[PDB]
Amino acid sequence: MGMDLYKTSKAAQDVWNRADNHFKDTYGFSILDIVINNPVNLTIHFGGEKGKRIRENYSAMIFETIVDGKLKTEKIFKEI
Amino acid sequence: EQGIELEHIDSKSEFAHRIMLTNILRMMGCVKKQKSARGIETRPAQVILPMSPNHGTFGGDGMYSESKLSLETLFNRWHSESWANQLTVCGAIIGWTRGTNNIIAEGIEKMGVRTFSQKEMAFNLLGLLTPEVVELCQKS
């Protein structure tokens, strides 16, 4: 989807680039490899420094929940 | 190779040097090409170089010394070169493991020295993969 336009519009690939590059560096995980061939499963490796930096970044998101006004801080990623 | 001293270093050694050094170099030199083409940079491959303290201290082992001695130069490069993210060196040691000269092991152990069964030295190198050390290799 759009991967044709992404091959054509300089002003368009300047979006998928600024996006995946950001995801590539912040979640170790690129969309441009997702859309051009949808994989069934996706394992995220937590390598060396970049790896640890990305894994804490994964664990840094919190799913709050309304319970009697309580902004209950609980973990997005339980297996992490 | 045994019995090979300096005037006997020839084909069989120049071959063994490739089995041990320049192809362990081209094993690492060629998982990076695959690490880097996929873009994999968070799953680095810990290398376990079998080293030894025998650097020409024993007799005529052939070119077995400057083979396994020219493997600690694999630290002058993990910091120097570009393959640091895909490979992490974790040197090791051939201690004195019995099996593969076996009749004088009981002799040395009288010098307060430990010699290892293969299953014992198995345990050690295998503890070199423990999730603790894996990080420790992954800083330095």
> Are A26 and B23 a contacting pair, CB within 8 Å?
no
Concatenate the DSSP letters of all residues of A29-78 into one string.
Answer: --SHHHHHS--S-------SHHHHHHHHHHHT-EE--EETTEE--EES-S
B13-22: long-range contacts (C-beta < 8 A, 24 or more apart)?
B13/B62, B13/B63, B14/B63, B16/B62, B16/B63, B16/B64, B16/B67, B17/B63, B17/B66, B17/B67, B20/B64, B20/B67, B20/B68, B21/B67, B21/B68, B21/B70, B21/B71
**Contact at CB, B88 and A48, closer than 8 angstroms:** yes
Q: Tell me the chain B residues in contact with residue A30 when contact means C-beta distances shorter than 8 Å.
A: 39
CB B57 within 8 A of CB B43: no
Q: Which residues of B touch A54 (CB under 8 A)?
A: 42
Yes or no: say if B40 and A48 are a contact pair by the CB < 8 Å rule.
no
Q: Determine contact: B85 vs chain A, CB below 8 A.
A: yes
Are the C-beta atoms of residues B137 and B88 closer than 8 Å to each other?
Answer: yes
Q: Rounded to an integer, what distance in angstroms lies between the CA atom of residue B84 and that of residue B12?
A: 33
Question: What count of Cα atoms within 13 Å lies in the side-chain half-sphere of residue B64?
Answer: 18
CA B34-A41-A62 angle, 5° bins? 110
Q: How far apart are CA B118 and CA B102, in angstroms?
A: 12
* Residue among B107, B102, B87 at smallest CA distance from B33: B87
Contact A44/B at CB under 8 A: yes
Which of A27, A30, A50, A53 best tests the B interface by mutation, with the highest count of B CBs <10 A? A50
Contact B24, B74 (CB under 8 A): no
Q: Does B125 touch chain A (CB under 8 A)?
A: no
According to DSSP, the β-strands at A66-67 and A70-71 are antiparallel
Query: Among residues 7-36 of chain A, which lie with CB inside 8 Å of chain B?
Result: 24, 28, 30, 33
- With CB atoms and an 8 Å threshold, state whether B138 touches A28: no
Q: How far apart are CA B68 and CA B94, in angstroms?
A: 10
Closest CA to B93 of B135, B27, B48: B48
For this entry, resolution in Å reads: 2.8
Q: Look at B85 and A50 and tell me if their CB atoms are within 8 Å.
A: yes
